[model samples]
Target: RGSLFSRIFGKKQMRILMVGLDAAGKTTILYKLKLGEIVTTIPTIGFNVETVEYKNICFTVWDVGRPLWRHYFQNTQGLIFVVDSNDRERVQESADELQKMLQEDELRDAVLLVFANKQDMPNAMPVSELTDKLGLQHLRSRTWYVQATCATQGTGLYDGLDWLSHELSKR
Candidate 1:
C-alpha cells in the first residue's frame, strides 16, 4: 500500500547500482554526493550503500566493484557505469564491461548513467570522446546519458542526480 507521505509529496525511491573498474572513482563519487566533500577511499572490497534524499526523491546508491556487480543488479532502477576519463588505455576495457552488463536481462530496462569521471585531470578525456569510445550511441533501447564528472570537486554530480530524479519520477 502507498503511504500518505508518498501521496502528499509524490515521493519516489530509486535503487541505483554503480559499477566500474577498480579505480574509476565510484566510491569517491558516492561519498562526495553523500557528504558534499572529498573523502579518501581505498579500493572497494565489497560494496557500499547509502540512501540520499534530494528533491523529494530517495536514492539508494550502491557503490559496487566490477567482479561482484551482478550480485546487486536485481531491481536496479538506475545503472551508473563510471569511467576514469584520464585512463585512456582502459576505455575499451570499460566499454567491454559495460557491453557485458547491457546483455543482462535484469538491466535491460534500467536507466543508464555513464559518468566520465576524473574530468579534472590534465589528460582526462572529454565526454564526447568517452561517449564515442564507449559506443553509447548504439544503445538505443535504454535511456542513457554520459556526464563529465570530477568527484574531487563535486562537479556534475548533482546534474546526474537531477537526471536520475527526473527519470525516476516518470516511472
Candidate 2:
C-alpha cells in the first residue's frame, strides 16, 4: 500500500540527456564537469552516463552520440542538444534532426537545452543566430534553453549551468 503523501512529494533526481551529431562535444562536456580533465578523447561508443551532484541537485548527464548512439536514447529527463557552432553549414540540418528526435514520445517531457558548442573557433555562429536558424521561437513555450559555450575550454559552462538551475528551480 502507498500513501498519498509519499507519492505526491518525492525527491526525483534530475536526469539530463546530451544528444547531437558526431563530435558534438557532449562527452567532452561530461568529462570536464566531472573529472575536470582534457585527455585526448575518442568518439563515445554507445553512450556515457554520468551522475554529477551540484548544490543538492543530482544531475545525470547522459553523453550520447547521434548517429552512433541513437539506439540507446531512452529514460531521459532533459535533453541537451549540442552542435559545433563553427560548423555553420551543417547547423540547420542538425537542428532539424533534433527537432524530429524530440517528437518521439520518449523525450516529449524532457527540457531541451541547445548548446551551440565550439565557441572557441574563429567563425562560430553567435547564440542568437543559432537560435533563430533552429526556429527556437517556435519551441519557446517548451521547457528549453539556448546557450553558447566552448565545452573543452570550460568557458560559459557555469553560465549555462546557472541558466539550467533557474529553469529547473521554476519547475
Candidate 3:
C-alpha cells in the first residue's frame, strides 16, 4: 500500500481552517507558514486563504479572523485555532468562539490544533491553562492538541503542522 497508495492519491491534501478572535495573530501565522516569515498584518474582518504544503500534504488554509466563520467550516479537514495567550482579558471570549464553532456539525471530524501563540511573551499564558480555559480537556470527539508557538519568530509553527499532517494521514 506504499507506492500504490501514492499512485492512487497522488499527493494527499487537507483543507485546514484557522480562526481566532481579532488580534490573535491569525494573519501573521498565515504568512508565517506560507512565507516562512512574519508579515505585518492589518485587522482581517473576514478571512484569508493560503496553500501550505508540508510533510507531503498540501493544506489549503483558511485563516478566518467571526460569526462569518461558519461558512468556512464545511469540508474542513483540520482546525488550527490561534490564541493570544497574553490577552488574559479575553480568554473567555476566545473560548466562547471556539466552543460555539465546535458545535457545528460540519466540523465533527475535523482535527483540532490550538496554537497558543505569542508564547514568547513573558506574560503569555501557559499551555496547560489555555487548554483548560478553552475546554479542550473535555474534548471527546476528535483528535485535538494545544501547543506553544511564537508566530513572530516562526517557532513551533511547523511542529504544529507536523502534528496536523500526521493526523491528516489517519484520514
Candidate 4:
C-alpha cells in the first residue's frame, strides 16, 4: 500500500492525469518532468505513467490520449490539461474538450492545472488569452491554475509542479 512509507517517510502522494488534444505536447511535458530533459517522442498510443518526486511530494503523472483518459480518472487528485499555445485555431476545440472532461464524475474532485504549452513559439497565445478562451474563469467548482510552459526549453514546468506540490501539501 506504500502506506507505511507515506506515513513514516512523511511523503505526500498525488495522482495526476495529463491530457489534451493530439499534438498538444502532453508527451513532451511528461518526459520532460520525468527525466528533467527534453527528448523526441512519438505520438502516444495508450498512456505513460511516471513518478516524479517534487517538493517532498510524489506525483504520479499519467500522460494519456483522449480516448483512454476516462479510464485513468478514477483516482486522480489532479488534472493537467495541456494546450498547444501556438495553434491558435484549436483554442475552441481544446476548450470544448476540457469542458467536456470536467463533467466526468471521476474527475469531480480533481484539482485542475492547465499547461499553456509550446509558449516558446512566436505565435503562442498569452496565458490570459488562453485562460479566457478555455473558460477557466468560469470554473469555480474546482481549484485551478494556468501556467505558460515551453516543454522544449523547460520553461514554466517546475513552476507548474510547484503549484501542485503546494496544493497537495494543503491536503
Candidate 5:
C-alpha cells in the first residue's frame, strides 16, 4: 500500500481496458483523454497503453486488439465497449460477442461501459436502440451509461469515463 513512487506520485492509479470489434475508436478515445483534446485518427496495431491523471487519480488504459488471439488480455480491470453508432449492421454481433464474453468467469465482476460513438454522423444509432439491441437492460440501473461520442472530437468521452469510474468504485 506504500511505495516510494506512491509517495512521489501522490495518487492511486487504476487500470481500465477498452475492448470491442476492430476499428472501435478505442485508441482515439485514449489519446483524447491524454491530451484533453480531440486528436487525429490512428490505427492500433496490437494494443495501445495510455496513462492519464485527473483529480489525483491515475488511469492506466489498455486498448486491446479485437482479434480472437488478443482475447486473453480482455480480462483486465473494468471494460469499455466502444462501438460505431453508425455501424448498425454489426452492432448486434458486437453485442452478442460482448454478452458471451461477460459470461466468462474472469469477466463477471468487470464493470461494463458502453460508448455509443460517432453521433456526429447523420445516421447514428440512438442510445436506447443500442442498449435494447445489446440486451443490457438487466444491468444495475445506470451501471451501464450509454453516451453518444465522437472520439475525434472527444465529446462525451470523459462523461463516459466518469460513469466507468463510479461503476468500478462499487466493486
Candidate 6:
C-alpha cells in the first residue's frame, strides 16, 4: 500500500506541444530547459521531444510543426507558443500561426503558455506589446499565460514552468 505522503508527492506527467516560427528560439528554449546550459542549435527540420521534469511534474514537450502539427495535437494537455520578441517584423506572422492553432478542435481544452523569448536582445519588445500584438486577450475561452524570457540566460523560464505546473494541478 502506498503512503498518503508518497501519493501526494508522486510525479505527474503532461504532454505539451511547442510551436513557433523558425528562429523564434523554440529549440533553444527546449534545450535550455532540458540541459540547463547554453547549446548551439540549428533550424529544426521536423520536430523534437525532450522530457523535462520540474517540481514533480514531467513535461513531454513536443517541439513540432508542418503536416506534423495536427499529429502532435492529440493528447496535448498544454501548448507552449514561443515568440522572438526581438523580431518585430515577424510578430504578425507568429500571431497568424497562433490564431490558426487555436482554431483546431484538439487544442480547445489545452492550456496556452506563450513565451516572449529573446527578451535579452537590445531591440526586444516588451511582453505587454507582444501580448497586444498577438491579441492574446481575445482568447477568453482558453487558459493562457504570457511569460517574458531570455532562453540563452535561462531567465523567466522556470517562472513559466511554475505557472504551467499550477495550471496542470487544477485538472
Candidate that would win on lDDT: 6
Q: Which ranges in model 5 have alpha carbons more than 4 Å from their true place?
A: 1-10, 35-75, 139-142
- C-alpha lDDT of candidate 6 relative to the true structure: 0.74
CA-lDDT, candidates in order: 0.72, 0.65, 0.73, 0.73, 0.64, 0.74
Q: Name the lDDT value of residue 62 in candidate 2.
A: 45
lDDT of 5: 0.64
> For candidate 1, what is the lDDT?
0.72
Over the stretch 62-170, how does candidate 2's per-residue lDDT look in tens digits? 4322553343345555677888888887887887878776777667666787888998899888888888887878774477778888998978766666666556654
Tens digit of lDDT per residue, candidate 1, span 1-171? 432222322555556667788789876676665423333333356445444444443444443226544555677787889999999998899999888889887688888889889999999998998999989898777889888899889898777767766776776
Better of 1 and 5 by lDDT: 1
lDDT of 6 by residue, 26-127 (tens): 766766665333233323564454454444433454432355556657778788898999999999998998998898987888999999999999999999
What is the per-residue lDDT of model 4 for residues 13-48, given as tens digits with 9 covering 90 to 100? 566667788888876665665433323333356445
- Report how far off residue 2 is in candidate 2 (Å): 34
Q: Backbone clashes in each candidate structure, one number apiece? A: 0, 0, 0, 0, 0, 0
Top candidate by TM-score: 6
Name the weakest run of 10 consecutive residues (lDDT summed) in model 3: 1-10
- TM for every model, in the order presented, reads 0.76, 0.69, 0.76, 0.75, 0.69, 0.77
User: Over all chains combined, what TM-score does candidate 5 have?
Assistant: 0.69
Superposed Cα RMSD, model 2 = 8.1
lDDT string for model 3 (1-171, tens) is: 332212222366566777788789776776655533332322355445445444443344443325544565777888888899999999999998888768888788889999999999999999999999999888786789897999999888878877777787766
lDDT for each residue of candidate 5 in 148-171, tens digit (9 for 90 to 100) = 799999888767776676666534
Question: Which candidate, 3 or 6, has the higher lDDT?
Answer: 6
Sorted by TM-score, highest first, which candidate order results? Answer: 6, 3, 1, 4, 2, 5
Candidate 4 global CA lDDT score? 0.73
